[PDB]
Ligand binder design. Structure first.
Ligand SMILES: [Au+]
Ligand SMILES: [Cl-]
Ligand SMILES: [Cl-]
Ligand SMILES: [Cl-]
Length: 129
């Protein structure tokens, strides 16, 4: 599913992601933007042979199982394909565990590169939450 900007922002809230580990909601929406352009079915291979899955490009090297990433963990105890659902509970459960990993949102290279320090509130502009 391709979520609307406000649509995702509200789903993320209801799921507790907003101010999670102290990252304000527009940090998340910003991250989802640049990782997946809001598309839950987004998949992307990395040079190391692992793949990133879904709305937040959760990586099969440590977080989920895809059956093809050699030497890999499944910290979120889920098959990577559940990270492609239209309901984002699974990706969000997993992202909670990733951002609690010690480096916060830096774990999303794209967040650090494109959202970190910018005016994130702009991503939840005009939304009814
Ligand atoms: Au959801
Ligand atoms: Cl594997
Ligand atoms: Cl949802
Ligand atoms: Cl932090």
């Amino acid at each position: 599913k391709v979520f609307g900007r406000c649509e995702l922002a509200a789903a993320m809230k209801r799921h507790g992601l907003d101010n999670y580990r102290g990252y304000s909601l527009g940090n998340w929406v910003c991250a989802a933007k640049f990782e997946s352009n809001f598309n839950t079915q987004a998949t992307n291979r990395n040079t190391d042979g692992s793949t990133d899955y879904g709305i937040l490009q959760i990586n099969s090297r440590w977080w989920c199982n895809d059956g093809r990433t050699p030497g890999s963990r499944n910290l979120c105890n889920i098959p990577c394909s559940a990270l492609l659902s239209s309901d984002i509970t699974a990706s969000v459960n997993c992202a909670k565990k990733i951002v609690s990993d010690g480096n916060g949102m830096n774990a999303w290279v794209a967040w650090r590169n494109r959202c970190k320090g910018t005016d994130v509130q702009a991503w939840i502009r005009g939304c009814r939450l």
